[PDB]
Design a protein around this nucleic acid. Structure first.
Length: 48
DNA sequence: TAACCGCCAAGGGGATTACTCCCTAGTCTCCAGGCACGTGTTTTTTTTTTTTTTTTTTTTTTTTTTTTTCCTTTTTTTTTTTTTTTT
């Protein structure tokens, strides 16, 4: 439910965004959300 | 087989006596290197300030806007009331 993939007390060391709310806007949006792949690199890197 | 002994022969040079001479022993007298004393200028040691690289710390990561979801403790020890058993 929360999305933190680990212990509740030690959720700061756990990854966030593994579990997401399913996008029920269209059928195609649901199919795109069911076939999504996420990179573990954070969204602040200057390396391209 | 020639060491050794006996016998004989020959000669060479150290010992002896005398004359000489010359070099050193001895004694003054002047003076100068040999030596006692003081010290040095290089040599080592110690500080002193810098240098140079390594390591650690710290701070940073464009802005604005709109929706959900989950959570906003929890086990663990101590206390306190209740219930049951016994004389």
């Amino acid at each position: 439910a929360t999305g933190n993939w680990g212990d509740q007390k030690k959720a700061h060391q756990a990854r966030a965004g593994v579990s997401q709310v399913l996008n029920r806007l269209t059928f195609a949006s649901t199919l795109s959300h069911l076939r999504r792949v996420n990179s573990p690199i954070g969204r602040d890197g200057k390396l391209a």
